[PDB]
Amino acid sequence: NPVDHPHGGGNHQHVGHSTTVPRQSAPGQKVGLIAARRTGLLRGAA
C-alpha cells in the first residue's frame, strides 16, 4: 500500500515513477535501483 512502500498503491501493480533514484535520496525513498549508472539487459561490454 502507499503507506507502506513508495511502490505501493494503484489499481494495477506498478511503480508509477522511475525505479532509478538519485544517490542522495532520503531514507524511506531510497528504494529500487539506487544511483543506477545504466539499466536493462546488456549484450557485450567490459
Binding site: 502507499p2 503507506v3 507502506d4 512502500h5 513508495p6 531514507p27 524511506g28 531510497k30 528504494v31
Partner: protein
C-alpha cells in the same frame, strides 16, 4: 506514511543469528614472529560454520 522495511532493518529483529557460530575468522595478530620470520602451527579441526 509509514516507516518502510529498509528503514526498519536497523537492528533488533534483523540482527544476525550467531549462537551456533564457532568464532570470528581473523587470521592472527601481527607479532614479531610473523614480522621477522615465520611461525609453524598445526591445523587440528575443520568445521562447518552455520
Amino acid at each position: 506514511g509509514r516507516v518502510i522495511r529498509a528503514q526498519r532493518k536497523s537492528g533488533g529483529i534483523f540482527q544476525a543469528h550467531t549462537r551456533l557460530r564457532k568464532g570470528a575468522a581473523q587470521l592472527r595478530t601481527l607479532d614479531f614472529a610473523e614480522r621477522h620470520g615465520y611461525i609453524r602451527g598445526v591445523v587440528q579441526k575443520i568445521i562447518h560454520d552455520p
